[PDB]
């Protein structure tokens, strides 16, 4: 085994060889030279990240105040309009004309139900809606089990028809506005503009079971947040059909709950245990509810019924005050069949003043006495609900919000506050969106205070979407580098706006569906959960980020600079990036907005080119017939002008881009000058490289392909044969290697993938990249990232000439940080190139981490898909490992032993690059396995919830809670 100085001297002649090959062939110092040679085609402006945040915080203020004004007027009209409605019952005499969504639009149908008359609308196709729509009226959604033509429903479509004039007045004023909808108390919803619903009832074989009342946006503006507590009666009498019904009501009751709502679930049979692991009221987020809905299911009925120990346990649960709580409506609901005891004594003290509200549910078909339960409900200002059937569950476990809304409708104007929802997928397929809601109240005869019998309910709730693609147009990231971004946050820790946030729903648990019990054609529910990713789950968690995260939940302003490690774009690397954060509150709302920058991004380039010939000359550089002397040029699909659209077929896009500058001068009076201009300047900078430097050295021996991925989207792979293999995203702010090249001050090597499809190994090769780094007036800039795809065959020859190809004495390999295998001496390994090195000899890799040579961090990706397990895709959690050098020390000697054998490995790290060289004795001499240490998205179901909630994350609830008005009717059950 060679000495430590021989490995030292032999690494230094093959890290000097790779870097000279990459410093020379790519042209780092040449592209630095021509950014500095000009100085005057551009100027260098600063990103004032105090100022940028303040500017952004105000476009989201004004956007969400403009939405709010529209909401207020609609509400006023609805209140005024229905106070002048007459309650007619002759509807076959005077037809109600409306367009009904989810109905066949074929003219020849002509069903013509009594009372109603439909509309055939004309349906232009649209952008900002990715569906055909009509701007002349509002559609109407009736849920499926609700009959339309009922006097109760027919009378909504009469009075609600005056909203189409106010609907129209909102979009005339603001073209950008998205869905406008009124969700009725009656269960009928009207939205503008009209479009056909996505599931028709019976024209396909999937049938929608969508109810407006059920909806989260409808619920948050229906009522105030609430600490509920479900009691379940588990006595012996319940076992049977009735027990079956209860498990489906509680799961149903929960759907109703929200993050702001706290909830626990207890159960009694002569003792009250608590159904799961929790013991206090927990946040009723997606996870906690998933635990409770998984413990409600396993319940077995046995034993004597005791309503006294069931309501003692409930009240005690209600009084914890140590835990984090909603502290608003306090209510307890019991599911039971029949009661012989009213438990008068427990209610006298625990709730002598009736602070708590009791709702009693009688379920199943049975003969047990319901008088005592009704009495309990009446005594406590709750309500009573029967459920005999499965189809009766859905409208009675949502109906309690008519009771809880009462002291809000007695609060008057004070209760008309806009609230904005958690991001969620739109019913109509719009994408991620948030809705601002306002409740409409039933005011009839207010002038004189004549009735009030049913004047304590809301007419319904009114909402208006903001799409998250509308907010991302108020937070522009182009001046800032790929590293910089804006993050938005609730007072709940959830992230409103984040690079990491994705359309797929956030998943819980490992998905298990039983194929042996899905009959083929019945169509179960798909999903309704909100997409609540948290800030400490969108990014790698620190302790110096939980400080930042708490500090901008409680509405403060500030900046912070620290060293933290960024997870890479692809999930394979972790790079220590020195960042600065800066946050401020959006003053109209409860959102607070932040901005990450990396020091060195504090300055950007603005293009200062305006000459006729110079913008002209740089623009034919990106012509696809002129790639024989330029290099297969790419271009990023920014929204350059409003007219040319991002196309995802890039040769399509670059023609429509470059047609645009010929057919019209780049002045373009409805199009931003700087973004297009910077691109033009850039293409004259990645031209002078490809003309005056790369086309001189037309073939370097080991060099396969040469790229300049730059800022302005223009990536230039140098031979067109090589550009067929360029499998990157052509958007330069989505490339992984672009972003890892900017963090590092040394050449970076990217490992090719293992297996997969497409040619990514011998054909393209392993790639090196390096950020260009210029200084203008003593101000650091990193404009571009040069690079090289390496030839893996040639590199091997230099490497071979104490390692002999296929040697049985000892094997040596080169590994980039992250532990991926780039080069293998044996060749039984270099076939499996770009593979995680702990999968080809897991014994050595395990030891290396122990020596402190390597470090890692497992994280959770709450938005990913996986195949089900037997117990096409669902959402699930994956755990993800990344590996990264944590020790700066250059060399590491030692020996590892498996038991009865020693192997002496020597590790040396090449200077000036992330690569590491290790020499070790052949694996075959000691037959050892430990277990195969693998690095992949690995399906898992963590973290366990029962341990998170003992020390929950900081949170801030709603300031205004409406409950317990003294003059509430409290007489109807």
């Amino acid at each position: 085994f060679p000495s430590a100085v021989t490995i030292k001297s032999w690494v230094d002649k093959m890290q000097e060889d790779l870097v000279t090959l990459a410093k020379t062939a790519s042209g780092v110092h040449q592209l630095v030279d021509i950014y500095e040679k000009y100085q005057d085609l551009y100027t260098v402006e600063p990103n004032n990240a105090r100022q940028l945040v303040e500017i952004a915080a105000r476009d989201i203020e004004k956007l969400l105040s403009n939405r709010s004004k529209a909401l207020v007027r609609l509400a006023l009209e609805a209140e005024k309009v229905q106070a002048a409605h007459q309650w007619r019952e002759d509807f076959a005499s005077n037809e109600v004309v409306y367009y009904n969504a989810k109905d066949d639009l074929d003219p020849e149908k002509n069903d013509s139900e009594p009372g109603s008359q439909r509309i055939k609308p004309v349906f232009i196709d649209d952008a900002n809606f990715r569906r055909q729509v009509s701007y002349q009226h509002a559609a109407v959604h009736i849920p499926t089990d609700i009959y339309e033509g009922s006097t109760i429903v027919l009378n909504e479509l009469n009075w609600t028809s005056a909203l189409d004039d106010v609907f129209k007045k909102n979009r005339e004023e603001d073209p950008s506005l998205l869905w406008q909808v009124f969700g009725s108390a009656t269960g009928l919803a009207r939205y503008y503009p009209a479009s056909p619903w996505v599931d028709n009832s019976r024209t396909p074989n999937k049938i929608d079971l969508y109810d407006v009342r059920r909806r989260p946006w409808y619920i948050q503006g229906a009522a105030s947040p609430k600490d509920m507590l479900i009691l379940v009666d588990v006595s012996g009498s319940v076992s049977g059909l009735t027990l079956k019904l209860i498990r489906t009501s509680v799961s149903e009751m929960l759907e109703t709950l929200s993050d702001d709502d706290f909830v626990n679930v207890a159960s009694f049979n002569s003792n009250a245990q608590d159904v799961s692991c929790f013991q206090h009221l927990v946040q009723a987020n997606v996870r906690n509810k998933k635990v409770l809905k998984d413990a409600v299911n396993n319940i077995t009925a046995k034993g004597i019924t005791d309503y006294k120990k069931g309501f003692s346990f409930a009240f005690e649960q209600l009084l914890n005050y140590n835990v984090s709580r909603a502290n608003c409506n306090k209510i307890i609901m019991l599911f039971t069949d029949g009661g012989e005891e009213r438990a008068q004594e427990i209610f006298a003290k625990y709730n002598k003043d009736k602070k708590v509200r009791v709702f009693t549910f009688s379920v199943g078909q049975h003969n047990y006495d319901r008088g005592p339960i009704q009495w309990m409900a009446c005594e406590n200002k709750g309500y009573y609900y029967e459920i005999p059937s499965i189809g009766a569950i859905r409208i009675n476990t949502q109906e309690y919000l008519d009771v809880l809304g009462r002291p809000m409708v007695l609060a008057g104007d004070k209760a008309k506050q806009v609230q904005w929802t958690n991001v969620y997928l739109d019913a109509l397929e719009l994408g991620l969106v948030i809705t601002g809601t306002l409740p409409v109240f039933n005011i009839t005869g207010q002038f004189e205070n004549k009735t009030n019998l049913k004047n304590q309910l809301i007419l319904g709730v009114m909402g208006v979407d903001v799409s998250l693609e509308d907010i991302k147009r108020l937070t522009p990231r182009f001046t800032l580098c790929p590293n910089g971004y804006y993050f938005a946050i609730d007072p709940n820790g959830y992230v409103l706006l984040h690079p990491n946030l994705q359309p797929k729903p956030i998943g819980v648990g490992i998905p298990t569906i039983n194929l042996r019990k899905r009959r083929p054609n019945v169509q179960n529910p798909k999903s309704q959960e909100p997409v609540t990713l948290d800030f400490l789950d969108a990014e790698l968690e620190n302790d110096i980020k939980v400080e930042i995260r708490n500090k901008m939940i409680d509405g403060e302003s500030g900046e912070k600079t620290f060293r933290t490690l960024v997870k890479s774009q692809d999930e394979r690397y972790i790079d220590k990036g020195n960042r600065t954060y800066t946050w401020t509150p959006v003053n109209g709302t409860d959102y607070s907005l932040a901005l990450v920058l990396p020091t060195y991004s504090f300055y950007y380039i603005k293009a200062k080119i305006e000459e006729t010939i110079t913008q002209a000359r740089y623009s034919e550089t990106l012509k696809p017939d002129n790639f024989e002397e330029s290099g297969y040029t790419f271009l990023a699909p920014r929204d350059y002008c409003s007219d040319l659209k991002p196309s995802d077929n890039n040769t399509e896009f670059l023609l429509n881009f470059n047609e645009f500058i010929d057919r019209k001068t780049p002045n373009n009076p409805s199009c931003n000058t700087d973004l297009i201009n910077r691109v033009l300047l850039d293409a004259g900078f990645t031209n002078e490289l490809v003309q005056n430097y790369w086309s001189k050295q037309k073939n370097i021996k080991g060099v396969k392909a040469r790229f300049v991925v730059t800022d302005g989207g223009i990536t230039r792979v140098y031979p067109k044969e090589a550009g067929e293999n360029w499998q990157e995203n052509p958007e330069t702010y989505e490339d992984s290697f672009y972003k890892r090249s900017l963090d590092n001050d040394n050449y970076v090597f990217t490992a090719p993938y293992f297996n997969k499809s497409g040619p990514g190994a011998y054909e393209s090769g392993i790639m090196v990249s390096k950020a260009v780094e210029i200084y203008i007036q003593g101000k650091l800039l990193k404009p571009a990232v040069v690079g090289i795809k390496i030839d893996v065959n040639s590199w091997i020859e230099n490497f071979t000439k104490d390692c002999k190809r296929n040697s049985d004495v000892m094997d040596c390999v080169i590994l980039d940080d992250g532990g991926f295998l780039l080069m293998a001496n044996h060749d039984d390994y270099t076939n499996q190139i770009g593979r995680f090195f702990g999968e080809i000899d897991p014994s050595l890799m395990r030891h290396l981490v122990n020596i402190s040579v390597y470090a890692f961090n497992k994280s959770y990706d709450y938005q990913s898909v996986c195949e089900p397990g037997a117990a096409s895709k669902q959402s699930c959690i994956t755990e993800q490992t990344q590996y990264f050098f944590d020790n700066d020390s250059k060399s590491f000697s030692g020996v590892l032993d498996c038991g009865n054998c020693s192997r002496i490995f020597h590790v040396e790290k090449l200077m000036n690059t992330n690569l590491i060289f290790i020499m070790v004795e052949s694996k075959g001499t000691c037959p050892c396995d430990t277990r195969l240490l693998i690095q992949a998205e690995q399906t898992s179901d963590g973290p366990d919830p029962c341990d998170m909630v003992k020390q929950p994350r900081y949170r801030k609830g709603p300031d205004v809670c409406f409950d317990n008005n003294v003059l509430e009717d409290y007489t109807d059950c």
């Binding site: 076992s239 049977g240 059909l241 027990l243 079956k244 078909q365 003969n367 059937s389 499965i390």
Partner: protein, 48 residues
């Protein structure tokens, strides 16, 4: 009532209406087995 009282706790959603839960109902069920009518479908609920 002793053999089949409170023993029909099946978790199906179907109606087994000739059961043995009260005394009036038990008496009615007993009468239905003497008239012969559908007497064996009353027995299958008692084997299950």
């Amino acid at each position: 009532m002793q053999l089949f009282g409170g023993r029909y706790d099946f978790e199906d959603t179907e109606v087994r209406r000739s059961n043995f839960d009260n005394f009036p109902q038990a008496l009615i069920s007993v009468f239905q087995v003497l008239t012969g009518e559908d007497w064996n479908s009353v027995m299958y609920n008692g084997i299950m």
